[model samples]
Structures are given as C-alpha cells and as structure tokens.
Target chain A: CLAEGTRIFDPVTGTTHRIEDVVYGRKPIHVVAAAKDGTLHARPVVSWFDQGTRDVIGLRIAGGAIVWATPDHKVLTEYGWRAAGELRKGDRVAVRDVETGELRYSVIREVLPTRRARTFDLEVEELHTLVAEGVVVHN
Target chain B: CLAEGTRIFDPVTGTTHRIEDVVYGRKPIHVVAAAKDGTLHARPVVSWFDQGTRDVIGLRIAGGAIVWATPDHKVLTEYGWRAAGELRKGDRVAVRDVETGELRYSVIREVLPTRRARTFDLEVEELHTLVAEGVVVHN
Candidate 1:
C-alpha cells in the first residue's frame, strides 16, 4: 500500500505521482509579477475554486514558496542560502524547531537525487499559506 | 482505493483534494495577461523545478481552462461563451471539436457560479503564450 508522502512511479506514462496529492493545497503555487490596469505588481499567489459554489478565489502566498520537498532544493542556513547540491549530510541548517516555536538548528539527515527537470500542474490544488524555514528550494 | 479524478473532502481542514493531484500535469491551466519590462504578454503555464538540480523550468499550460466544466467539466456542443450565472441549460456555445480540428457548436448542460474577481499566483506559473478565443471578458 502507498503511504502519504510516498512517490509513486508510473511505468506506463513515464511520470510519477506523490502521495501529497491526496490533500488539497499541497501542490506548489506559481509566484509571478503581473500588471493590472497598466500597473505592475509582484505577488506570489495560488488560485482555488469552491466545489459546490465554484467561487474562484486567488489566495496570496504566505510563507515558504515550495513545490515539493526534495534534495536538489536549497535551504537558508546559518551560512546563508546554500544549494542542496553543496550541502553535506552532517551540515547544519536553519529550521524552526516545531516543538518550541523558536528558531533552532537542524541537520541534514539525508539527501536524494531527483530528475533533471520537472513539470507541475499547479491549478489542481487549492490556494494555501505555507511556512518556510528554508526547508526546500527548487532552483 | 481512490482513483484519479476523485474529489475527496477533508473534515479537519474543510477542503477537498482531487485524486487527479497525484498526476502533476492533469489540472486545467489558467491563462492570464501580464506585463514585464513594459511589455505585455500572455502565457498559459505553471512553474516547477528540478529536485535533483536547482534549475527551474516554467511548465506551459496545455489543456482545459475549465472552471467546473459545465455538464461536469466536459467539452460542450455550442460555440458561444456565457457567464456561469447567466448560462442556462440548452444554450448553444462554441467549442473546437478536436476530432475534425474545426470550430463546432456546443450546448450548455450545466451552470456554475464563480467569483466576480479571481486572483491567480502567476509567479509560480510562468507567463508564456496564449490563444484568445474571446471566451472570457476580464474587464
């Protein structure tokens, strides 16, 4: 059985799915700068629609703009924002210790390689606010 | 087991997740207008990155721009675009019949109400190109 957060590979389609898909607001939202009425603005956001009402809402991105948690991403560490490719297993980075609600240190437990490039469909997921302690970075 | 395209509700979060989320490229991409460097452009797309490499790629939108497709989000038989609140059953509209690669007539089998104003996170989804068919009047 597939567990939540598990990545499932489809041998037939050459594509893979993540268990995170089971939850709404889990997909990464696109962040962009746009112009409205001839005015330019930069705001990160996600769009969602109600199921029964179909009331579409464009929600603003709150914190960590993440697409997925993977190794090839980067994190804001004490040494500054460093690439995941350069991080070592024993190296320390920044993470808000979930237990104390204060800034704390976390070590890289493991690192895994991912595909060279990935395509995501962000529209399927609802808009959500996510907290980023420099958890993952996609270049 | 939940199959793809299934909309599952979460009691804790008061949101729904679609099984289609398991597939990355299955959502109907929203096409929008934006400006950069004083240049206006349109692109139907989503933004994504490589997990193994920090390289980022903005994936282009390729399918339905559905807002709770009428008659269950399926293609219609009419050729005219109508507002959800004003749409009625048996109304004729326009849809491109992919089979013959021609403009065809379609009928409205359902109507869904949406917000008067919608916000989308275009940053996460990059701007690319758009084909305007006069479907929506965003003014």
Candidate 2:
C-alpha cells in the first residue's frame, strides 16, 4: 500500500489524487491501469482499503520520480513483480508517460526508509493494477 | 493485509485455508463476512490481491487467538477501527465464535513483532469485511 499522501494518476480526469482523498471521497474514480502487454488504459476503482499506518520506504527512480509506499508494496519491474524493499538501485520499474500514455521503464536510483505513516490501497476491475506516482503498482 | 500463511476461515467449506493458498488458487472462494450489525454471513470473494512481503506483527488476543498481519492492517475494536500497531494491551477486538455463529470481543494480551513475511488481501462485494484467523478485519 502507498502512504496517505501518495498521488495516483487518474487518466480519466487528466489529474492525480492523493490515495487518501480518492479512498475517502467514496465517489466514482478511475486510474491509469496497465494491461498484461504493458498497455495503459483507464479503469474504474471498485473499492479502497485503508491499510492503516505503518513504516514506509521511498524509491527514487530514474526520470526524477519518487514513490513512497510500504516495504511490502509491489511495483512492476523489468524482472517482474518486486517489493519496494527488495528493489535495488538500477532496477527498472514500469512508468507511464501521462502525456503520451506510453509505457516506460525507469531505473531505481535509491531506496530510502521514510517514516511510519498511514497507508491505503484501491481495487480495480479486470487488470487489477494501477499506476501510482507515475509508476506501475499492483492493486 | 495478513501474512501469506495466515489462516482465513472459509464458512462455505467449514475449513480454513492459508492466505497464500487462497490467492494462488484463483478459484471461486467464500469466507465468513460480518455485516454492519455484526451479523455473520458467507460472502463470495470477488478478487484477491498480492500485497507483496513485509515485516508483520502478531496480536495475541484473549481466548488464545493470535493474528499475524502487517502492523498497519486495521481490525475492528470496541472503540472502532484501530491499526494493529496502534492497539495496546487489553484493547478488545471483534472475533467470531465459529461454532455458535456469534460475535465476540476479545482483549489483546500482547502485541509482538513477529517477522518479515509475504502479505495478501482480498476484495468482497457489499460488506468488504472478512474474518481472518478468527478475528474481524477490514478489507
């Protein structure tokens, strides 16, 4: 799960929302989802789960993107699903080019332990995956 | 989210299955669910999510029940929803009397940091709550 303030890309509105707001809003929401072939599409969020507060870590990836999530949170990597805690510098994680809707891979530049904070996760239909902070994450 | 090997009670089969087995099976599965009024019912699982692996803690509640989950995972408490990490000794958590089909509250005897392990969660229609390891947990 991502930290409370983590931003999730909502392709439908061409904007991003804090994972906390999206979950608390309880309104219809959509996020950028990835298909098996690495294609990106807009998918509706079925529901959200408040994963509570815990220690979180930050992954500084290439392209100047940084994502804060639970150590157990899984991100799509070139080698397949890898937890934020298991990812190492130079590992490529899938990302979305919001402008072109193109799938890109960015290398991890650093893995840093952040703070203990509230966390949340959302569920999507069909694909069961979503992009957070521009990086692909499992739902 | 609960650890991979944590047992989830399946009301439909009157048996318990490891959280890992349930997610990997990808087959139709049902678990005991709780309604707003604390009514127990069987709910079909819409989907399962692999939350990756992380450090988990154990909450040994009264009645000899111990639940292992991510520190951030929320469980129903007498005072309302509280994270496992926020719970303290003597805090009461909701539990299911499997044989009587009744709801009960048990006191937390101890909170222990157990280990770093894999975790997973599931989605259910309507209620979005499930019983894990005999304790009530939010989904």
On lDDT, the leading prediction is 2
Candidate whose TM-score is highest? 2
Summarize candidate 1's per-residue lDDT along B18-137 as a digit string, tens digits. Answer: 423412453334432222221223343333222221111111112332333121121112332223334465665443333442333445444434322211111123322111221221
Off by over 4 Å in 2: B4-139
Off by over 4 Å in 1: A1-19, A22-71, A112-139, B1-139
Each candidate: what lDDT?
0.29, 0.80
Per-residue lDDT tens digits of candidate 1, residues A12-73?
Answer: 24244453352246433332121211111222323222212211111111232122333322
Q: Judge candidate 1 against the unseen true structure and give its global Cα lDDT, from 0 to 1.
A: 0.29
Residue-level lDDT tens digits of model 2 in A1-139: 7888788877888777889988788656899888766788899986676777777899998777788997767687886566787788888999998578788898888987768888887867656679998899877
What C-alpha RMSD does candidate 2 show over the true interface residues after superposing them? 8.4
In candidate 2, what are the lDDT values of residues B48-68, reduced to their tens digit?
A: 667777678999978777888
lDDT score, residue A11, model 1?
22
* Positional deviation of residue A68's Cα in model 1 after best superposition, in angstroms: 7.8
